[PDB]
Amino acid sequence: TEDPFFTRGRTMLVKLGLEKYEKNFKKGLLTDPTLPLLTDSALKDANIPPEPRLMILDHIQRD
């Protein structure tokens, strides 16, 4: 079930093949509760480059 840490985000990144950015999620406090609320600007603020950002947004917006 949903908890306030990072496990669901990590599983999502693994599926999307973007585990290298889990570090960015942790430093930017993009915890599991933020996942459905993520925005391009929030991801850009965590220093994630454009094409990876858009892969993640497309996913959390439609899934």
Short mmCIF file of N, CA, C and O in Angstrom, two decimals:
data_model
loop_
_atom_site.label_atom_id
_atom_site.label_comp_id
_atom_site.label_asym_id
_atom_site.label_seq_id
_atom_site.Cartn_x
_atom_site.Cartn_y
_atom_site.Cartn_z
N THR A 1 0.83 -1.20 0.00
CA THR A 1 0.00 0.00 0.00
C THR A 1 0.87 1.26 0.00
O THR A 1 2.09 1.18 0.14
N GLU A 2 0.24 2.42 -0.16
CA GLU A 2 0.99 3.66 -0.29
C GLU A 2 1.65 4.05 1.03
O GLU A 2 1.03 3.99 2.09
N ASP A 3 2.91 4.45 0.94
CA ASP A 3 3.67 4.97 2.08
C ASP A 3 4.43 6.22 1.65
O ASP A 3 4.47 6.54 0.45
N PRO A 4 5.02 6.97 2.58
CA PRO A 4 5.59 8.28 2.24
C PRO A 4 7.02 8.28 1.73
O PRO A 4 7.62 9.36 1.64
N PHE A 5 7.60 7.13 1.38
CA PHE A 5 9.00 7.12 0.98
C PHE A 5 9.15 6.94 -0.53
O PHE A 5 8.39 7.53 -1.30
N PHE A 6 10.12 6.14 -0.97
CA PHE A 6 10.55 6.19 -2.36
C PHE A 6 10.38 4.89 -3.13
O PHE A 6 10.80 4.82 -4.29
N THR A 7 9.78 3.85 -2.54
CA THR A 7 9.80 2.54 -3.17
C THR A 7 9.02 2.54 -4.49
O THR A 7 9.48 1.98 -5.49
N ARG A 8 7.83 3.15 -4.51
CA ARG A 8 7.03 3.11 -5.74
C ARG A 8 7.70 3.90 -6.86
O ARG A 8 7.67 3.48 -8.02
N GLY A 9 8.31 5.04 -6.54
CA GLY A 9 9.04 5.78 -7.55
C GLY A 9 10.20 4.98 -8.12
O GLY A 9 10.45 5.01 -9.33
N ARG A 10 10.92 4.26 -7.27
CA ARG A 10 12.04 3.45 -7.74
C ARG A 10 11.56 2.35 -8.70
O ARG A 10 12.18 2.12 -9.75
N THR A 11 10.48 1.67 -8.34
CA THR A 11 9.94 0.64 -9.22
C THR A 11 9.50 1.23 -10.56
O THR A 11 9.69 0.62 -11.61
N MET A 12 8.93 2.43 -10.53
CA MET A 12 8.53 3.09 -11.77
C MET A 12 9.75 3.41 -12.63
O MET A 12 9.75 3.17 -13.84
N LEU A 13 10.80 3.96 -12.01
CA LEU A 13 12.01 4.28 -12.76
C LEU A 13 12.62 3.02 -13.36
O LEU A 13 13.03 3.01 -14.52
N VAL A 14 12.67 1.94 -12.58
CA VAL A 14 13.21 0.68 -13.07
C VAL A 14 12.44 0.23 -14.31
O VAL A 14 13.03 -0.13 -15.34
N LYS A 15 11.11 0.24 -14.23
CA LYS A 15 10.29 -0.15 -15.37
C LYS A 15 10.59 0.73 -16.58
O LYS A 15 10.80 0.23 -17.69
N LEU A 16 10.62 2.05 -16.37
CA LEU A 16 10.93 3.00 -17.43
C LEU A 16 12.39 2.97 -17.85
O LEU A 16 12.76 3.68 -18.80
N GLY A 17 13.23 2.20 -17.17
CA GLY A 17 14.65 2.17 -17.48
C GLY A 17 15.36 3.48 -17.18
O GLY A 17 16.19 3.92 -17.98
N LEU A 18 15.06 4.10 -16.04
CA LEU A 18 15.64 5.39 -15.68
C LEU A 18 16.07 5.39 -14.23
O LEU A 18 15.92 6.39 -13.52
N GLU A 19 16.60 4.27 -13.75
CA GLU A 19 16.97 4.17 -12.34
C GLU A 19 18.07 5.14 -11.95
O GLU A 19 18.19 5.48 -10.77
N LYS A 20 18.87 5.61 -12.92
CA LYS A 20 19.92 6.57 -12.61
C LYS A 20 19.38 7.84 -11.98
O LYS A 20 20.12 8.55 -11.29
N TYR A 21 18.11 8.15 -12.19
CA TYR A 21 17.53 9.37 -11.66
C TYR A 21 16.83 9.18 -10.32
O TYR A 21 16.29 10.15 -9.77
N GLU A 22 16.84 7.97 -9.76
CA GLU A 22 16.33 7.78 -8.41
C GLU A 22 17.04 8.71 -7.42
O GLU A 22 16.41 9.23 -6.49
N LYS A 23 18.35 8.90 -7.61
CA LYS A 23 19.08 9.85 -6.78
C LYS A 23 18.46 11.24 -6.86
O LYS A 23 18.35 11.94 -5.85
N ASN A 24 18.06 11.66 -8.06
CA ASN A 24 17.42 12.96 -8.22
C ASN A 24 16.09 13.03 -7.47
O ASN A 24 15.78 14.04 -6.84
N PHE A 25 15.29 11.96 -7.55
CA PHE A 25 14.03 11.93 -6.81
C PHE A 25 14.27 12.10 -5.31
O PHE A 25 13.54 12.85 -4.65
N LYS A 26 15.28 11.43 -4.77
CA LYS A 26 15.55 11.48 -3.34
C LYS A 26 15.99 12.88 -2.91
O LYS A 26 15.50 13.41 -1.91
N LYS A 27 16.92 13.49 -3.66
CA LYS A 27 17.39 14.82 -3.30
C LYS A 27 16.30 15.87 -3.48
O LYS A 27 16.23 16.83 -2.70
N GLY A 28 15.45 15.71 -4.48
CA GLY A 28 14.35 16.63 -4.70
C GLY A 28 13.09 16.34 -3.90
O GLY A 28 12.08 17.03 -4.08
N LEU A 29 13.13 15.34 -3.01
CA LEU A 29 11.97 14.99 -2.18
C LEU A 29 10.75 14.69 -3.04
O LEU A 29 9.62 15.07 -2.71
N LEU A 30 10.97 13.98 -4.15
CA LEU A 30 9.86 13.48 -4.97
C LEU A 30 9.48 12.11 -4.44
O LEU A 30 9.77 11.06 -5.03
N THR A 31 8.83 12.12 -3.27
CA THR A 31 8.41 10.90 -2.61
C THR A 31 7.22 10.27 -3.33
O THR A 31 6.62 10.86 -4.23
N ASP A 32 6.89 9.04 -2.94
CA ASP A 32 5.79 8.33 -3.59
C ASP A 32 4.49 9.12 -3.60
O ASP A 32 3.77 9.05 -4.61
N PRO A 33 4.11 9.85 -2.54
CA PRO A 33 2.89 10.66 -2.63
C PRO A 33 2.91 11.71 -3.74
O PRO A 33 1.83 12.11 -4.19
N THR A 34 4.08 12.17 -4.18
CA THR A 34 4.14 13.16 -5.24
C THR A 34 3.95 12.58 -6.63
O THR A 34 3.65 13.33 -7.56
N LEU A 35 4.11 11.27 -6.80
CA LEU A 35 4.12 10.68 -8.15
C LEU A 35 2.95 11.12 -9.02
O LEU A 35 3.19 11.61 -10.14
N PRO A 36 1.68 10.96 -8.62
CA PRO A 36 0.57 11.42 -9.49
C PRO A 36 0.53 12.92 -9.69
O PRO A 36 -0.20 13.39 -10.57
N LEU A 37 1.29 13.68 -8.91
CA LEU A 37 1.28 15.14 -8.95
C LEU A 37 2.50 15.71 -9.67
O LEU A 37 2.60 16.93 -9.81
N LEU A 38 3.40 14.85 -10.14
CA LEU A 38 4.64 15.34 -10.73
C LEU A 38 4.36 16.22 -11.94
O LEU A 38 3.44 15.97 -12.73
N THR A 39 5.17 17.26 -12.09
CA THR A 39 5.11 18.17 -13.22
C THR A 39 6.49 18.23 -13.88
O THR A 39 7.50 17.93 -13.25
N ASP A 40 6.51 18.59 -15.17
CA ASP A 40 7.78 18.87 -15.85
C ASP A 40 8.66 19.83 -15.05
O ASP A 40 9.87 19.60 -14.92
N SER A 41 8.08 20.90 -14.50
CA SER A 41 8.88 21.86 -13.74
C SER A 41 9.45 21.22 -12.48
O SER A 41 10.59 21.49 -12.10
N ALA A 42 8.65 20.41 -11.79
CA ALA A 42 9.16 19.73 -10.60
C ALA A 42 10.31 18.80 -10.97
O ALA A 42 11.31 18.72 -10.26
N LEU A 43 10.18 18.10 -12.10
CA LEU A 43 11.24 17.19 -12.53
C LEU A 43 12.46 17.97 -13.01
O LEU A 43 13.60 17.60 -12.71
N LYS A 44 12.24 19.05 -13.77
CA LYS A 44 13.35 19.91 -14.16
C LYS A 44 14.06 20.46 -12.94
O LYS A 44 15.29 20.60 -12.93
N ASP A 45 13.31 20.80 -11.89
CA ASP A 45 13.92 21.33 -10.67
C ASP A 45 14.81 20.30 -10.00
O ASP A 45 15.79 20.67 -9.34
N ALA A 46 14.50 19.01 -10.14
CA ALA A 46 15.33 17.94 -9.62
C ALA A 46 16.49 17.60 -10.55
O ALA A 46 17.19 16.60 -10.31
N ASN A 47 16.69 18.39 -11.60
CA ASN A 47 17.85 18.29 -12.48
C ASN A 47 17.77 17.08 -13.42
O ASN A 47 18.79 16.51 -13.80
N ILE A 48 16.55 16.70 -13.81
CA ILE A 48 16.35 15.61 -14.76
C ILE A 48 16.22 16.18 -16.16
O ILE A 48 15.43 17.11 -16.38
N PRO A 49 16.96 15.66 -17.14
CA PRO A 49 16.98 16.28 -18.47
C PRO A 49 15.67 16.06 -19.21
O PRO A 49 14.80 15.31 -18.75
N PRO A 50 15.50 16.71 -20.37
CA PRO A 50 14.15 16.78 -20.96
C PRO A 50 13.56 15.45 -21.38
O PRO A 50 12.42 15.14 -20.99
N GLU A 51 14.25 14.65 -22.19
CA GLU A 51 13.61 13.42 -22.67
C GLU A 51 13.30 12.47 -21.52
O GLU A 51 12.18 11.94 -21.48
N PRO A 52 14.19 12.25 -20.56
CA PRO A 52 13.80 11.48 -19.36
C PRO A 52 12.61 12.09 -18.63
O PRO A 52 11.68 11.36 -18.26
N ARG A 53 12.62 13.40 -18.40
CA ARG A 53 11.48 14.06 -17.76
C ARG A 53 10.17 13.66 -18.44
O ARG A 53 9.19 13.30 -17.78
N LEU A 54 10.13 13.76 -19.77
CA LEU A 54 8.89 13.59 -20.51
C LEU A 54 8.43 12.14 -20.50
O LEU A 54 7.22 11.86 -20.48
N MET A 55 9.38 11.21 -20.50
CA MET A 55 9.05 9.80 -20.31
C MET A 55 8.32 9.59 -18.99
O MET A 55 7.31 8.87 -18.93
N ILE A 56 8.81 10.20 -17.91
CA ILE A 56 8.21 10.02 -16.59
C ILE A 56 6.84 10.68 -16.53
O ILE A 56 5.87 10.09 -16.04
N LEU A 57 6.73 11.91 -17.04
CA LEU A 57 5.44 12.60 -17.03
C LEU A 57 4.39 11.83 -17.82
O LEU A 57 3.28 11.58 -17.32
N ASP A 58 4.71 11.46 -19.06
CA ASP A 58 3.78 10.68 -19.86
C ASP A 58 3.27 9.47 -19.08
O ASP A 58 2.09 9.11 -19.17
N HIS A 59 4.14 8.86 -18.28
CA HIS A 59 3.77 7.67 -17.53
C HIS A 59 2.81 8.01 -16.39
O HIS A 59 1.70 7.47 -16.31
N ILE A 60 3.22 8.92 -15.50
CA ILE A 60 2.39 9.26 -14.35
C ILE A 60 1.10 9.96 -14.75
O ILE A 60 0.12 9.92 -13.99
N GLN A 61 1.06 10.59 -15.92
CA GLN A 61 -0.18 11.22 -16.38
C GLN A 61 -1.16 10.20 -16.94
O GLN A 61 -2.37 10.42 -16.90
N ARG A 62 -0.66 9.08 -17.45
CA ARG A 62 -1.48 8.04 -18.07
C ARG A 62 -0.98 6.68 -17.57
O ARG A 62 -0.16 6.04 -18.23
N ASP A 63 -1.48 6.26 -16.42
CA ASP A 63 -1.15 4.96 -15.85
C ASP A 63 -1.77 4.80 -14.46
O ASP A 63 -1.11 5.02 -13.45
#
